[PDB]
Design a protein around this ligand. Sequence first.
Ligand code: FES
Length: 106
Amino acid sequence: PSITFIHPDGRSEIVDAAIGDSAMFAALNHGIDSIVAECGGNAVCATCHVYVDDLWLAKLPPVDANEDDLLDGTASDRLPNSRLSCQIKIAPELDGLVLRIPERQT
Ligand code: FES
């Protein structure tokens, strides 16, 4: 599938992603440097932060208890649609997923 990423400035990048890649993995492996991801996809930092598009949130499995507490330690304050991009797993149904990246991760 394919994920759309949007920078603070509003510009877009379409990145390939296989089924099963996290959104972070997909980002890092196709040139999206802004996603710092200190812990390397290991669900223990708040630095792979993203905002899921208002319309795509519903299609994702819910945030768990761990991701939820991680999210209130973000560098840019959490929004309703905030997610940890290493905790988003890509599936056919997310082909087209839109993610916007915060002003900062650290
Ligand atoms: S990269 Fe550390 S939680 Fe996603």
